[PDB]
Amino acid sequence: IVEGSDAEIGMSPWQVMLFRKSPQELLCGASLISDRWVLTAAHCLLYPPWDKNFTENDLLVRIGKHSRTRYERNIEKISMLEKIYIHPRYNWRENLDRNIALMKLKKPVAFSDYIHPVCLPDRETAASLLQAGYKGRVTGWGNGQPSVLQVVNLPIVERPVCKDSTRIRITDNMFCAGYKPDEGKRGDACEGDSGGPFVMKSPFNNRWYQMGIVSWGEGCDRDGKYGFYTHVFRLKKWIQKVIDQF
């Protein structure tokens, strides 16, 4: 996260951090959608140009964390993965269309004041909130780096502006968010925040919904561009098919 502010304890209880087991390294963000399922970006798990092709036993996740460097005794939880499922149509060579993956925890995590799932949007919520100018939230660690979780709120961008901001062929399965290159503000998600959730709070029922998944980034600079996000509502039936069978 760049140009964000310190998140408060328990403010994003669905935030999950994905780690390589050996050597130990933080790889990406992710989100808790139930006591046993985690959503993330496919490129966090599979990206052949960088020789990345993880299997379940190469990774672990930590949930309920606030401080990046302090171990939070009796708060944070660790879990191994039973299975990983990447969207079969994930396009890693071109535009990262359908950049989404699900991970099943080996054992369910216990909910607490610090660990709680986010909602997936229903149709009315997606239609009502996914509009240009409306802001969503991304959370992650600062990157020198950070002490505690950081937060940034970013506005969804008009599709014509997103389309002209990049030479890649965008699809309706993604949207972009961020402030104009001027400087009305310029907080943003970064490479390390890939896979994490872009959430919005419904004014109608007071609940938080995950509308997007942070897509590709390199460093914290997009050279005048906007970050892209996988459109979760559009992929909701795929998520259901995987879970109802897995």
Partner 1 sequence: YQTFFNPRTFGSGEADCGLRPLFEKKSLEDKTERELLESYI
Ligand X SMILES: *[C@@H]1O[C@H](CO)[C@@H](O)[C@H](O)[C@H]1NC(C)=O
Tell me the Cα Rg of the chain: 17
For 242, the token pair is 């995987």
Cβ atoms within 10 A of the Cβ of 113, count? 10
User: Which residue from 164, 144, 139 is spatially nearest to 154, judged by alpha carbons?
Assistant: 139
Smallest gap from residue 156 Cβ to ligand X (A)? 32
Binding of residue 53 to ligand X (CB under 6 A): yes
Binding of residue 131 to ligand X (CB under 6 A): no
Binding of residue 57 to ligand X (CB under 6 A): no
> Which stretch, 46-54, 73-81, 98-106, 153-161, contacts ligand X (CB under 6 A)?
46-54
For 126, the token pair is 């997606």
Instruction: Name which of partner 1, ligand X, none residue 57 binds, using a CB cut-off of 5 to 8 Å depending on partner kind.
Output: none
Binding of residue 48 to ligand X (CB under 6 A): yes
Instruction: Name which of ligand X, partner 1, none residue 55 binds, using a CB cut-off of 5 to 8 Å depending on partner kind.
Output: ligand X
Measured from the CB atom, is 96 or 151 closer to partner 1?
151
Contact set with partner 1 (CB under 8 A):
5, 7-11, 13, 32-37, 108, 111-114, 116-120, 122, 129, 133-137, 151, 153, 155, 200-201, 203, 206-209, 240, 243-246
For 74, the token pair is 């009796």
Binding of residue 88 to ligand X (CB under 6 A): no
The amino acid sitting at 153 is N
Measured from the CB atom, is 42 or 138 closer to ligand X?
42
CA distance linking residue 113 with residue 169, whole number of Å: 42
- C-beta of residue 208 within 8 angstroms of C-beta of residue 33: no
With b for 16 or more beta-carbon neighbours within 10 A and e for fewer, the 45-81 pattern comes to: bbbeeeeeebeeebbbbbbbbbebeeeeeebbbebeb
For 176, the token pair is 């972009």
CA distance linking residue 66 with residue 71, whole number of Å: 9
Smallest gap from residue 207 Cβ to ligand X (A)? 35
Measured from the CB atom, is 1 or 42 closer to ligand X?
42
Q: What residues line the site for ligand X (CB under 6 A)? A: 46, 48, 53, 55
